[PDB]
């Protein structure tokens, strides 16, 4: 029973939800995101919205969010076990790494940020509020949906048998994940059955797996099948990363973690790029380059700032790996 | 002889303007920024707005922009000598540098980006349209002004004799400026008279100038006195950088360039941090931390996402160098 075997069953309305991990003090930026989701798709195809916080939500936060969302909303606090140091982690060591990296890279000195990355990597998908669902669409605060979305995306994913959907890709700052690749490759050598014969390795590596090109999918935007994270393959991959310690001794983000897994554990035709969904998560945009799609969906983004084909993005690498025909003027973005 | 400050004191309604370098394809983001500036300050304290482009602006662009700005607007094209490779730059060497750095750092492979950095560093303050002014306020597309601004800021700079005003500070990616610091220190070594005896070196260095801590002020937001860039010290400095080659052989940004000059050539009390102006330039915010200021000006940002005192920001370094007392809750931003 392979990884896909755990996913194909979920292939009449799909069981799905939007999911948001957020802080009380980010209310204004969250309300702005909700307004975008509501006007661009949620009024048309309603799905419940799950809100998660490592601390309890204030009544002010809940009242404002409940009022702003038109479909059903659910608020949850996450378990102490999913947001706290594991017994095998040396906290004094973790504290020194933080202090030393405070000014070295973004969130380098942040204690809470690392707990968040670990949370998004191995726990959000098994929070009690997501168990009844098969699909989720992650939404962060201060986001923009630049265009109308006129079809149910979960329905679409379900009918087309897609597992992982994304919009923005990029090269990770390596100082942030020094030993992530080595750790992941050792896992695969130990568990060859988990490496799909038709995987997307070429997106992650230019040398047949020897080294990592640092490419990954942005995690702030994800529309995916929860059964992937719930598979033995992913569960065992996360546990290996957890025990190695990178989430705390380095600054492993959930994005490169979700990406390496999706790209290695699945037949590559299970991964999908929503070239049609206009989106912004500071500081980058995914703006539809197809004029018909851009105009029919009343996109509000400047096509000229689409990040997809810019050098530091991994859109080119993704297109070549999938054998997708890149848009006519894709090279302009490398100027 | 005549010092750097001798060139500025005379300018102490002031002759001022907003100034925007921008592309035709960034129209929607530009109009967005304009609406913010209009609503938060320009309709109350009108000042002329200058727009610049290395290419001619389209009629669609000028029409939309002319209508959106309530004060007088001026459109200008850049002299080609302020946006092209100087005769001493080896273009093949530069092309190779770009091709290699394409996927290494943001804008690594971009040719236009480097000309933009050189433009903001040594020429925007020489454009014909800025000749009649003593002050400028730089504004970029996709910006937000979170709060109302209830005083004329140029007037305030003049009356308070300030030269350089900013909102966000951050650590530069060293990979883009490997030899910038060394080039700058040699300049000072040969021109000790341009080093103000009461400067802000401590913001840039933790070891009395031996090395650069990489701190700089974000140039997308600047309210400054043009006469600073017009002074002999800055002209000579820019010329030194221009001949060293870094704008094209590395990826020198104008922000670090403007910052090293301001922090070394001026008495430190001439640099000013606008703790009261709410601002966002993807992906960081400057959000008024003072309650009365935040409320009185109806700020729209989440105080909890203020970047100022985050580790990777240089607000801490800035306050300590100026001797400004940091707000009580500054450490929370380091969690
Ligand atoms: C959990 O993680 C913990 C954190 O890593 C870890 O703690 C210990 O880790 C190792 C294990 O032994 C220790 O490493 C030794 O460090 C000695 C130097 O100690 C001093 O310097 C430390 C580093 O300072 C740097 O980093 C700081 C923060 O990052 C920074 O602030 C500072 O500016 C600087 O950049 C520093 O951390 C120490 O602080 C502690 O002590 C202070 C003074 O008492 C105190 O004020 C402070 O509060 C802390 O409590 C120290 O200041 C090295 O000298 C030593 O190296 C020698 O020994 C090794 C052993 O193999 C040799 O390989 C090496 O070559 C050296 O040997 C030469 O010298 C000996 C001397 O005779 C000679 O015999 C030999 O021939 C050689 O010539 C070694 O590197 C580390 O100090 C510990 N850290 C702390 C904070 O406790 C725990 O082990 C982890 N727990 C578990 C269960 O694994
Ligand atoms: C301008 O840059 C080019 C591109 O790097 C230089 O080309 C040479 O670079 C190496 C010499 O240092 C060698 O690989 C070759 O001599 C040559 N490379 C090729 C084939 O392009 C060139 O020397 C530079 N010219 C100047 C102005 O010094
Ligand atoms: N509850 C909670 N959510 C957090 C915390 N840190 C980050 N988040 C959320 O996790 C997501 C990613 O955080 P963000 O700060 O946007 O990280 P970035 O995208 O890397 O800049 C956002 O939805 C945040 O609101 C935290 O400490 N607690
Ligand atoms: N006219 C013109 N403006 C440019 C060009 N590249 C950047 N700019 C402007 O320079 C400023 C900084 O550019 P931006 O792309 O936002 O750079 P970033 O802030 O580093 O992400 C903005 O005002 C842009 O509109 C260019 O090629 N031509
Ligand atoms: Cl803990
Ligand atoms: Cl940070
Ligand atoms: Cl040229
Ligand atoms: Cl880029
Ligand atoms: Mn985010
Ligand atoms: Mn910008």
Question: What do you see in this structure?
Answer:
It is classed as transferase. Keywords: alpha/beta fold, nucleotide-binding domain, rossmann fold, binary complex with GDP-MN2+, transferase. The structure is a homodimer of 335-residue chains. The first copy, chain A, has 335 residues and is of the alpha/beta class. Chain A has one domain: Spore Coat Polysaccharide Biosynthesis Protein SpsA, Chain A (Alpha-Beta Complex), CATH 3.90.550.10. Chain A has helices at residues 3-7, 27-42, 59-68, 91-101, 111-122, 153-159, 180-190, 201-204, 226-229, 232-244, 246-249, 254-265, 291-296, 315-322, and strands at 16-21, 49-53, 73-77, 135-138, 144-145, 164-166, 169-171, 215-217, 222-225, 271-273, 279-281, 284-286. In chain A, the strands form 3 sheets. A 7-stranded mixed beta sheet of chain A has the order 3-2-1-4-9-6-10. In chain A, a hairpin with a 2-residue loop joins strand 11 and strand 12. In chain A, helix 2 packs parallel to helix 3 (59-68). Chain A is globular, with a radius of gyration of 19 Å. Chain A starts with a helix and ends in a 13-residue tail after the last helix. The interface between A and B is large, with 36 and 38 residues. The structure holds a molecule of 8 linked components (NAG-NDG-BMA-MAN-MAN-MAN-MAN-MAN), a molecule of 2 linked components (NAG-NDG), guanosine-5'-diphosphate (GDP) (2 copies), chloride ion (4 copies) and manganese (II) ion (2 copies). One chloride ion is lined by residues 84-85 of chain A.
